[model samples]
Target: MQKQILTSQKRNMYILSRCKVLVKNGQVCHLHEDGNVYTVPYANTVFIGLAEGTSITNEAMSMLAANGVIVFWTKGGGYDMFAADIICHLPQADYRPTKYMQNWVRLWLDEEKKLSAAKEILKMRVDSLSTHVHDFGVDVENKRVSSIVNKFDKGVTQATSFESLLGHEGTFVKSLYKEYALEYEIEFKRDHKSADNYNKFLTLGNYYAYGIARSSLWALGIDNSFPLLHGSTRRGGLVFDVADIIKTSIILPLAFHAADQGMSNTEFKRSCVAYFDKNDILAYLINNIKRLCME
Candidate 1:
């Protein structure tokens, strides 16, 4: 009968579709079959996707924000929900910590420090991929994987300018695509409009990761406008920058895993939420961002 709201680090994610959500008797409620009202446990949730046609009352929305749940307004068939636009329910600014933002801005304003931060993120990616690839049944000895490791070791390490870093990042990703495509036997081409299972899963997973990253940044009071690696010209580039840290280890493998099984979008989304919860990914993201900002 009594429970405390979960810390963001321990919260879970949920995808709700085609439901009307409201506060009923001081609890967050969502409509479902059999004319039953099910409580949406905002206290234990960090992210919730409200798919197209889903409606929520202002009371329920405030309750969710008050409890630190980030909500997304999503589009696509209920089967393939992606955040059409992020509707961040951030904590009140006055109560949020400002230390991370202060540290972040100091680094962002200096070119060398900014480059160093970018390199750290790239290094983290390489390390994460190397550690997790084999666990996901990816062939570590495969030439593509080995080549990517080598390039990260040399090219990324020696990348003196953003241009060089971008070049290496591009090559690294292409090499990964080649390896995963071969491993999963998906007819993979990196086209946004491909509509292939792999691409769709990848994009969906990335969007979810982006939402998580954005939430982490907001929780830490770090603005999502300044980025170390991603382009500053983009408004939410920092979210992409943060999401990239986890994508190599979590999203890519899961996307390929889902694609290999020919999983439907709903199943894939559920799997992603499960994977993220099991990995304590929100905690990891917040810690990484804090560490980066601290340095």
Candidate 2:
């Protein structure tokens, strides 16, 4: 048997026609095309070409929702494409109210709780770093993490705006990585090396998280974008909302863990599999979201 090797390219273009771009490379490409041209910068460059009258049905859309692709020629151009990506990739299953899916739902929710706890524990670990470094003036790192946690918590509690929630979440994750670099005494070159590495890590984690969420949602047959926690947007308004719930809890912790252990994408995938194998949270959440949709 010949060994098939997947090379990470900085630049590669994919064209789509009436196809929902699922996972591009490894990350979920949310670009949608009604007819237009969009450029996605990866290691080098990849342009997504879309043809007009290329609408996707709910069933077809569901299948591609979990993968990444390039969509072009939409009203909002790449913006809409990204939006679709977010919406299609959400976890829409409702396991709580469904009798048959109850077990799966409970498992996913438990995993969510565990992941949430793990994030807090990681933050504490970062805080402990200050004790070891005398020059680590002011607990700014601690404050930053706490602030992000507080903001995300508020988003979850208030069910306010998805824009605000996602904005804060993105910032929070970025800060976590920066602090990790600083504390670990790792120098990230400002060139493509650092950018590529960070992008790959985020892309892998984000899509993996989205895939788990989407799969759960599909199992329950709920509208993945209709979220209770986040407001509606013009695009993936629903997935954005639902994803907010687990962004801080499950996704962030996993990403941080991967970075800490210097894990590659392959390793990260294994970690995700381990997570799902040990805990059925993804399946449970999907069922819960499904039942909710039925109601």
Candidate 3:
């Protein structure tokens, strides 16, 4: 029987493998090429990730929706999430509509509160770096990031708009990449460049994280446009807001360390997938974003 009502802890899910999914006998089927078929239980699942080259029957899509699953389509190689089921399982009429409107209202209302939230989000990122850089014993870069993040804390109150927050944040991220390059002794210029290996890995990993955030937000029926820190100029602005928290948490460190070791594209991608699975990113993003914004 399908679950009519479900709790948060039981609803979390993650999938990023390459495969075709089918539905038959009222069950979700995961069939592999080597004579393997895994059935996904419906009641406990709330998120489904369809990786690149994976196909799903209309039957499977309908079956999963009937049972409360939100599916995402991720591109090949890395998680470049392009499309999602934005209208899946509409909230109990009263719930999501209120919060979704309130989201834009909050954005339009108070500059002080907006600045405060942006500070909180960015602080989490920098603080995460503060704690994790030590695992590599790079003292100089550690001290630099610590000092820089603290400086940004002082300037947080000055940000009157999303542009303001992005201004400070861009500078901080640049300096961070410079510090990491120096620490790892590599001539890496960090930006959205195609050939820059570190940037390549970073973009790939970050997009995966982005897809995870979008899925989480959609599951909770939150508006993806009314962002607290990121503006409307970027696609999936709210999703970027959530992903900022995770990038500093894990992705950059892995990218830089992988670059430092001179790993291949394949090796770097493999490592990212491994860490993403190990962390159960689906639950973390969905649960936390839900708690912060909606009831």
Candidate 4:
């Protein structure tokens, strides 16, 4: 029986804790180590993470495809990944939502519109970071933060090219990192290869944010390749572009906070999982994407 399609707000993202996924009596079930089973409602599932020792049958895979669930085989608390399936299952072929994708293409083709789109995303980042810092009561140097943000905001309007805008964003992000590190009293340096607690938590939280962004874009039938700020050469540039909207507001803070509290890997990831739904992040991404495209 085909269930009614669920909206972004109604659906959820799940990270499997080492289990087998298989179809059982037309439903998806997770088999535990001792044969205990938990059924997941297909219509309400948008994303699933597969950890080591997790396997899914072809029939279960088929059902997930039909339901448009995104699947990822991941490591390190779902941060490092081998591969991912970003699926989109519309209710009907004729009903596939193409308007947003079409709009994205048209905007991307025009250099000015593309730049405007990038600025819009930057504006969002600025607004989100401002609000998050205030709401979270992060004790960073307010004057320093404001100084970096004000210059970045000014550059967002004055910059005429993507490269220049990126520089402004880089400065702003560096300032935030420095401020957060000082506030949390941790020896901090941004490195992709660093395995420190703050770095690991940052990467982990960012991947989760990317999952939500990718899921939302897939749901809208939007092209993840057509990025506004990130280059066209990068395949998943648009996914990163969209994810940036919430990274400063959500992921960045969580990483620093978790490090300051000395939370374990599992504990930090659980916090991110809780906040994803608690803030209705998926719905926010969907709505913002539509607004960005429609404008």
Candidate 5:
């Protein structure tokens, strides 16, 4: 009948194993492996990485929601029951389970807010990009990145429709990758999604990044159905919108640097995970989602 909220220094735990969680003794999630049991108290973990082959309880999920904790893996391969709707509950509003999605849907459907948020993010990216221009390359290549930023800044100011912003964003990404190819001197024959070995390296790095981002959004109570700059009916558009704000500084540059290191794709994905954990992407992510949900 007694417990303490987890302090910042004690929080942000990751469960990489197949874990089982329940309300037993008011714990957040408990993992059993190799005859050892691990327990987490309330708010003690930002997220519990619910790997496959784990048994989870309804009360464990409710406990997670009550304490702002997340279960953060939504990839397929028959993990369908752990999908986003698990965190989409509206118990805070006391709505019945069958019919409470619309209120949250309405929040993301607000166009003016999404537009203004994009303006802030787009401006921030271009303004801060100069600091990271050095990561792109030298002399001629650096000049190209600066020019890319300049053009994107103009589009951000002038675009009137979300569709127009979508177009502008696509063009901006092409330029980013163009310079990225030269910056690392690791040009391959295919683009980011062609599934060649090199593109696979970059794509899988972002695949995990998106998994992290989308789950964070769901846990923080942000609806991904409505997107500002993208029209994908799938969950990816919101992932695109959020990653646009953060990746130039984090994922993209890191991917390029890793690709240039000549590691196998397995090593590349593994090392990227290691890099994110060491650099604390989870912490920055919580802050970013708070900002997005706040304004």
Candidate 6:
């Protein structure tokens, strides 16, 4: 059977039976042969089933594991159980920050070079905003204007925490979208609005990318706890380090531009594809990781 990864960022209850989890009420419930059920507050996204098994439950778990699902057994903090021959303990020793994370830190710190490249793309957004401000005959030369631009450019350097960095990125992208709407004179309804939905999508997308980056580092035998950009916190610091490479250059800019252009979700996906293709930023990071693992 083909391997698959299942992620539930939202709250959920789960049942584990033999190995397979049955999702219930936005969560996975432990499966009981006799129909016994248990509830948990929430289920962190799980990874299961990288190995083969005879029973359907084991098979399902194995498939998810092979596909890189991170699994949590209980509601609160627990060990991460992998579907390999041995169940890898959650909060394992391997969670320390690795060389891969340090490399990302070095790249981001060279802002004199990286910001130049990022600014070129951001200028397009500024030009778009300028058009709207001009039409309003509003004085565009203000501290707020400069602050907004400076916020995005300096956000990478000023991020004290990983979450703060991501939040700033989200804010900048949302600002760009608001500017776009003003320029285009688009009238979106209060309910099911484009801006609101795009914000949620961008936030979730960043978290998803964060998880993937963390898992990749872990797979490379690097410590997820050792972080170069963010100080060691209770959570995934190394993953945040890796994610910084793509956040400003790829995720945030693309999300903002798409929302401004009034693109649908499908169109926004295409925007991501195009951004990655044009810059090769994500590919470069992935290759760098592979090379680090080999060394």
Each model's TM-score?
0.71, 0.41, 0.76, 0.73, 0.69, 0.36
Model 3 worst lDDT window (10 residues): 1-10
Q: lDDT tens digits, residues 110-140, model 1?
A: 8888888888888877766665543554866
What's the candidate order when arranged by decreasing lDDT? 4, 1, 3, 5, 6, 2
| Model 6, position 284: C-alpha lDDT score | 40
Best by lDDT: 4
Model 3 alpha-carbon miss at residue 142, Å: 4.3
Q: Determine the C-alpha RMSD for candidate 4 after optimal superposition of all C-alphas.
A: 4.8
> 89-166, model 5: which lDDT tens digit per residue?
444554343222343344457767657777766775564445433333343235676687777888788876877876
Q: Show the lowest summed lDDT stretch of 10 residues, model 1.
A: 1-10
lDDT of 1: 0.68
Q: Model 4 segments beyond 4 Å from truth?
A: 1-97, 133-142
Taking the tens digit of each residue's C-alpha lDDT, what string does model 4 give over 166-276? 777677778778877777776688777998777888887787777767656665656567777767688788679878887777788888788777889787777775565
Candidate rank order under TM-score: 3, 4, 1, 5, 2, 6
For candidate 4, report its TM-score: 0.73
Judged by TM-score relative to the true structure, which candidate is superior, 3 or 6?
3
Model 3 residue runs over 4 Å out of place are 1-8, 14-20, 76-80, 87-109, 131-142, 158-164, 193-196, 205-209
Between candidates 1 and 6, the lDDT winner: 1
lDDT of 3 by residue, 1-295 (tens): 0111122566344454555678757777877655467787666666666666667788887767665667766654324456776643342232245464565467447666556666766766665555443255245354676687778878775666677778887887787777777778776666675676677778867876676567556656665676777654766777888877777667777777876666887777767655655544555555555445442
- The digit string of per-residue lDDT tens for model 6 on 60-158 reads 444445443444332111112233222233343444455545554554466544343234323433433333232222234566556686666576555
> Whole-model Cα lDDT per candidate?
0.68, 0.42, 0.63, 0.70, 0.57, 0.44
lDDT of candidate 4 vs native? Answer: 0.70
User: Native-vs-model 5 lDDT?
Assistant: 0.57
